Amino acid sequence: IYQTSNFRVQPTESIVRFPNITNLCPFGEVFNATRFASVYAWNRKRISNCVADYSVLYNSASFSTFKCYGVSPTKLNDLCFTNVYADSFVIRGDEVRQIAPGQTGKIADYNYKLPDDFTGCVIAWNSNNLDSKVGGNYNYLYRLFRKSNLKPFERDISTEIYQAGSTPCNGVEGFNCYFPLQSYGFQPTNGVGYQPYRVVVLSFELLHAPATVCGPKKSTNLVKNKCVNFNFNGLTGTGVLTESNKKFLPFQQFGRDIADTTDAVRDPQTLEILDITPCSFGGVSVITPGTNTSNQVA
C-alpha cells in the first residue's frame, strides 16, 4: 500500500454573508437643498457613523464635474475610511476651475482653498435648477477686499472693512475703502460658465481613529449542502453549511470546539444556526500487487 495526495474537493462556489444594510448616510439629502451655505462661511459638515454610498454617477445632482482626487471612486463601497468632512458651498461655474490643489482665484483668496495632499472626492455640479433664481440671487456673498490670504480648512465669518493704501477708515465705505463682502449675479439667463454651481468636497482620514464609516457589504444568498467558500462578517473559509439545533445565545455570534476550530456560525441577517461540516480530506491511498507483469491498481 502507498499514499500519494489528498482528495481535496474543490470548493464549488463563493458566498459572502453580511447583516442587513440598516444604516445609510443621506448623501442625496445633503446634495440638494432650498438654501446652501455661502462660499464665505462654507459648510463644514461632519460625516460619520453612516454607511457611504457610491450608487451611480449621474445622480440627482447628475455629477457634472466629478473627481476623487486622492482615492478610488470605484471601490468607494469597498474602500473603508473614516471621519468624512463635507466642505461644501456655492460658487460660479467659471470658479469651478478653482478646486484642484493650488488653484487660485477669489475663492482661494478669501473664501475657500484645498490642500495639495488631498484624499477626497470633489463634486462641482451645475446648480442651474437648484440655486438658479429667475431674477438672480445675490445672497451667496463672497469676500473680495481683505489684506491677507486664507489657507485651506479655514472658514472666515467676519466682515472687517478693508483698508487700501493704509488709509484709516472709521467704518466709512468710500474711495479705496470698500465693504469686504460682495454679491454674485447668478442669473438664469447667464452663460454656462456663469451658471450657479454647487460643490461638495468629501475629505476624510485614513484610519486614524476607529473606523466609524465603512462602505456597504453586499450579502449573496447562502446555499447549503455544498463545499461553499464562505466569507461571513468575521471569518472566511471553506466548508459545507448545514442547519442545526445549537441554541446560540442572542449576543453569541460564533461557535467553536475544544480545539478552537470555528465550525458553528449564525446567519448575519436572520436567526439561522449553521454547522460548517468539513469537506473531503481523505488521503488518496493506492493498492497494487506489484509493478511488473500485472499493472492492475486500485
Binding site: 460619520s48 441554541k247 445565545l249
Partner: protein, 285 residues
C-alpha cells in the same frame, strides 16, 4: 467602604460559543474577593444625620465594574471623561424614561450635573422636573439614541430586589458596555450568586477617558418641606464599584453556553491548580 465581591465580574468577551467545556482566557476581569467601594444612595433625615451625598469622582484606571442594587430606581447614568470639561471631548450617559441618550457632547460638568424627579399635580405620578445636566457647546461628533419611552419605577423602601450590573471597558476605543438585569432579594450586601454579564453595545467613538462618575436624581415631591438639593427623602438604594485588573481566568461553560462558574488563575494555590491543569476539579497529587 470596603466589601467582598464574592463572584462578580464575569462576562463574554468573545462572541464564540463553547458547550460543556472550559476555557482559560486572559482579559480585564475583576479580581475575585477584591476590595469593593460601597456607595449609599440613602437619605437619612435625622437632624444629626447628614444627607448622604455619595457622588464623588471615581478613577477610570483600566475598566470600571459597577453594581447597582436599586429598587427606588434613582441611580441612572455614568459620566465619563479624562478632563471632564467642555474643552476635551468626553462621554456622558443618561437613562431618562428608558431612553439611553449616549453622546460625545462634552457639556459643563459642574457639581450639579444630575436629574430630578418630582410628583407633579397636573398628572398624579412622579414626572421628570429637573434637567440640569447640560449647558455648554455641543460640537457632537457622535449621537446615538434608542427611544423606548417607558417607566418602571416600582419604588420600594424596605427590600432591595432589582440589581443591575454594568461593566464599562475601553479597548482601542471600542468602548464596550456589558449589562445584566437580575431580580434579587438580599438587602444587606451583594448575594453570593453567579451571574454572567452579557454585552449591550460597543460604541466605536474612540474617546480618551480617565475619569468616571455616577448619575442619579435629586428632586422630590411637595410634601417634603424645602427644595430639591436642600430636602430629599426618597433616595433608597445602594451601589458598589470595583476596578477590573489584567488577569487570566477560567470559565466553565454549560450545554446551553451560559457561564456557570469561573475560576481565577492567580487567587490561591487550589485556584492555580484548577488553572494550569485545565480542569475544574483535580485529584490528589
Amino acid at each position: 467602604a470596603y466589601t467582598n465581591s464574592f463572584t462578580r465580574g464575569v462576562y463574554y468577551p468573545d462572541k464564540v460559543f463553547r458547550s460543556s467545556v472550559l476555557h482559560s482566557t486572559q482579559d480585564l476581569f475583576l479580581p475575585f474577593f477584591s476590595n469593593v467601594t460601597w456607595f449609599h444612595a440613602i437619605h437619612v433625615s435625622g437632624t444629626n444625620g447628614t444627607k448622604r451625598f455619595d457622588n464623588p469622582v471615581l478613577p477610570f484606571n483600566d475598566g470600571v465594574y459597577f453594581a447597582s442594587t436599586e429598587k427606588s430606581n434613582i441611580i441612572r447614568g455614568w459620566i465619563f471623561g479624562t478632563t471632564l470639561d467642555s474643552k476635551t471631548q468626553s462621554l456622558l450617559i443618561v437613562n431618562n424614561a428608558t431612553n439611553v441618550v449616549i453622546k460625545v457632547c462634552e457639556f459643563q460638568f459642574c457639581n450639579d450635573p444630575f436629574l430630578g424627579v418630582y410628583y407633579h399635580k397636573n398628572n398624579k405620578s412622579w414626572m421628570e422636573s429637573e434637567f440640569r445636566v447640560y449647558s455648554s457647546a455641543n460640537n457632537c461628533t457622535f449621537e446615538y439614541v434608542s427611544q423606548p419611552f417607558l417607566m418602571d419605577l416600582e419604588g420600594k423602601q424596605g427590600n432591595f430586589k432589582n440589581l443591575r450590573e454594568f461593566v464599562f471597558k475601553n479597548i482601542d476605543g471600542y468602548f464596550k458596555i456589558y449589562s445584566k438585569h437580575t431580580p434579587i432579594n438580599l438587602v444587606r450586601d451583594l448575594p453570593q450568586g453567579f451571574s454572567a454579564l452579557e454585552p449591550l453595545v460597543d460604541l466605536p467613538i474612540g474617546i480618551n477617558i480617565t475619569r468616571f462618575q455616577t448619575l442619579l436624581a435629586l428632586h422630590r415631591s411637595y410634601l417634603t418641606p424645602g427644595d430639591s438639593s436642600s430636602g430629599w427623602t426618597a433616595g433608597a438604594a445602594a451601589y458598589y464599584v470595583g476596578y477590573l485588573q489584567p488577569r487570566t481566568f477560567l470559565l466553565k461553560y454549560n450545554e446551553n453556553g451560559t457561564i456557570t462558574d469561573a475560576v481565577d488563575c492567580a487567587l490561591d494555590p487550589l485556584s492555580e491548580t484548577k488553572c494550569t491543569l485545565k480542569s475544574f476539579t483535580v485529584e490528589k497529587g
